[PDB]
Amino acid sequence: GSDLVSCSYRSLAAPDLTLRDLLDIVETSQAHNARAQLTGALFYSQGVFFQWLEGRPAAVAEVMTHIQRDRRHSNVEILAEEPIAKRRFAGWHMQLSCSEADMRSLGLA
Amino acid sequence: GSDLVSCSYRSLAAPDLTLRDLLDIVETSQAHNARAQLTGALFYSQGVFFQWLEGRPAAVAEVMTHIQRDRRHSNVEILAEEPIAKRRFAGWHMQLSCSEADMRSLGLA
Amino acid sequence: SDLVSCSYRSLAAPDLTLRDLLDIVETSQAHNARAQLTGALFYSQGVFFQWLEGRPAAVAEVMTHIQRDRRHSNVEILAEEPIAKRRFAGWHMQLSCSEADMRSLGLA
Amino acid sequence: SDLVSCSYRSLAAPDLTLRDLLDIVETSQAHNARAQLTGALFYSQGVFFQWLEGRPAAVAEVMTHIQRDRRHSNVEILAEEPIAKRRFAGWHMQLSCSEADMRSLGLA
Ligand SMILES: Cc1cc2nc3c(=O)[nH]c(=O)nc-3n(C[C@H](O)[C@H](O)[C@H](O)COP(=O)(O)O)c2cc1C
Ligand SMILES: Cc1cc2nc3c(=O)[nH]c(=O)nc-3n(C[C@H](O)[C@H](O)[C@H](O)COP(=O)(O)O)c2cc1C
Numbered sequence: 001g002s003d004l005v006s007c008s009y010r011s012l013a014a015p016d017l018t019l020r021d022l023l024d025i026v027e028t029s030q031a032h033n034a035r036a037q038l039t040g041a042l043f044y045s046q047g048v049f050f051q052w053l054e055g056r057p058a059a060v061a062e063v064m065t066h067i068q069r070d071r072r073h074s075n076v077e078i079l080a081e082e083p084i085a086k087r088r089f090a091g092w093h094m095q096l097s098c099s100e101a102d103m104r105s106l107g108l109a
Numbered sequence: 110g111s112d113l114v115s116c117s118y119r120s121l122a123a124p125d126l127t128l129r130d131l132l133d134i135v136e137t138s139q140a141h142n143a144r145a146q147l148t149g150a151l152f153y154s155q156g157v158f159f160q161w162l163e164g165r166p167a168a169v170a171e172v173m174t175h176i177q178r179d180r181r182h183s184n185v186e187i188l189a190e191e192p193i194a195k196r197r198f199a200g201w202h203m204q205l206s207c208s209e210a211d212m213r214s215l216g217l218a
Numbered sequence: 219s220d221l222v223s224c225s226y227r228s229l230a231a232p233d234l235t236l237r238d239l240l241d242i243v244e245t246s247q248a249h250n251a252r253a254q255l256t257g258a259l260f261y262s263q264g265v266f267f268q269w270l271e272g273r274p275a276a277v278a279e280v281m282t283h284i285q286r287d288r289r290h291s292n293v294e295i296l297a298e299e300p301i302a303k304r305r306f307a308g309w310h311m312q313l314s315c316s317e318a319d320m321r322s323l324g325l326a
Numbered sequence: 327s328d329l330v331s332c333s334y335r336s337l338a339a340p341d342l343t344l345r346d347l348l349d350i351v352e353t354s355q356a357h358n359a360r361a362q363l364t365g366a367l368f369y370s371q372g373v374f375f376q377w378l379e380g381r382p383a384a385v386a387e388v389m390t391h392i393q394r395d396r397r398h399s400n401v402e403i404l405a406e407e408p409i410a411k412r413r414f415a416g417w418h419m420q421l422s423c424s425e426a427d428m429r430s431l432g433l434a
């Protein structure tokens with residue numbers, strides 16, 4: 001609605017990140033983002049995360065304080081809140097992008 | 110080279126198939142197909158497998174006798190050997206196709 | 219208790235383009251929604267695999283069209299099975315197409 | 327001991343097409359192979375995220391071109407980090423682009 005903001009960041013996955021860790025992150029994010037009216041997209045490849053999160057300012061800032069402390073990634077490199085006129089990922093609580101090749105290495109680890 | 114054949118089949122995944130089962134299949138297939146000069150593609154979605162396997166007749170037929178007995182799928186619905194003029198998936202021992210959504214359900218199970 | 223699936227493999231027309239693939243998918247979304255068909259289309263390196271599910275009569279009807287479609291040939295020993303329930307509910311036609319294949323089809 | 331990465335997020339031109347995306351990727355394969363750059367390009371719903379890695383001088387050079395490229399805007403607080411080793415060796419530019427986004431860009 002009226003007040004909508006986006007947050008974008010790039011982080012580095014913990015060296016020991018497993019496939020189960022990624023699925024945990026995604027399941028956790030589905031449940032919470034749906035309750036908090038947060039949407040966006042999570043991209044994972046070869047130890048690199050990129051996330052776009054969108055919603056009201058408070059929900060975005062509250063979820064980001066937790067994401068920054070999460071021990072499954074480091075070097076969280078943030079882009080200040082940008083005002084947005086409308087959601088880009090409406091109905092996607094957290095859309096995952098993860099190739100078969102990344103699935104294979106995360107699993108075989 | 111000279112004598113090349115393809116084999117195509119559709120099967121139904123075991124109801125209890127996990128993400129680990131899929132990764133096992135794929136790892137197993139990478140190692141063997143590279144030794145036996147077999148190439149192709151494996152597609153998985155929502156309890157359905159499709160595979161294209163290609164190489165010399167003997168390697169193709171030997172690997173298929175094992176795939177048919179594999180308890181991780183059933184109802185293996187085969188297409189007789191087709192002669193092919195050249196490989197379609199050269200250098201791909203077993204290319205996997207598996208969406209994020211299928212990764213999520215296989216994991217959350 | 220009245221669902222059937224049809225499964226086949228075909229070989230794409232050698233001159234198939236990314237536009238052709240997109241058209242196939244957009245046409246299928248539209249007819250399948252209307253005819254209560256669901257399923258999955260896989261494309262890689264000149265090969266189609268398709269799983270189609272619905273009422274016998276609806277599956278039979280699209281298949282007669284699909285089989286004569288000129289964007290593929292060698293539509294093969296189509297495998298027809300009764301099913302207890304849909305595998306692809308919600309998916310009028312789910313496309314599977316890798317970035318590498320998108321790039322290849324795109325090369326025109 | 328002489329590798330750097332540049333990471334940014336940008337917003338695609340509203341009129342971006344699938345052809346535009348394909349061109350970007352084909353251009354990048356070619357220059358990146360030659361300039362010893364590797365990395366990953368992610369596209370979804372009007373948003374680019376890119377990770378680029380290589381020697382400082384090569385990363386600096388493409389970035390000046392990428393930043394003025396008209397197929398995107400709001401090229402954002404590009405995040406520049408020294409790295410111990412490449413994350414995307416072998417990938418001159420790996421594209422990530424879902425079937426749903428391919429369909430959308432295709433709608434022209
Ligand atoms: C890369 C990454 C992205 C994440 N994205 C979200 C998210 O979008 N929404 C969310 O609620 N938690 C997300 N998390 C998880 C949160 O950091 C944190 O774990 C959350 O507060 C509760 O999850 P937990 O119960 O596992 O600690 C993410 C974690 C990582 C490492
Ligand atoms: C859907 C599916 C596809 C498979 N594809 C191959 C394959 O292409 N190459 C191969 O060597 N084994 C493949 N397998 C595994 C074989 O059936 C069989 O397991 C193999 O002989 C040895 O694997 P195992 O040591 O786990 O039994 C496949 C299994 C399944 C269920």
Ligand SMILES: Cc1cc2nc3c(=O)[nH]c(=O)nc-3n(C[C@H](O)[C@H](O)[C@H](O)COP(=O)(O)O)c2cc1C
Pocket residue numbers: 228242245246247249250259266268270280283284285287289290311
């Ligand atoms: C590999 C392949 C798969 C197809 N799958 C479907 C499908 O599931 N549903 C459908 O309506 N058309 C499908 N088509 C397209 C049909 O062959 C046919 O073009 C369409 O039903 C008629 O299009 P029109 O009546 O709008 O002109 C497929 C075509 C190809 C080549």
Ligand SMILES: Cc1cc2nc3c(=O)[nH]c(=O)nc-3n(C[C@H](O)[C@H](O)[C@H](O)COP(=O)(O)O)c2cc1C
Pocket residue numbers: 336350353354355357358367374376378388391392393395397398419
């Ligand atoms: C989102 C985005 C990412 C790009 N990434 C690269 C890249 O990694 N390497 C590259 O050479 N060009 C990349 N480009 C294209 C460059 O901006 C520029 O067009 C190119 O270097 C010059 O093309 P030309 O000299 O062949 O005409 C990218 C463009 C966009 C919009």
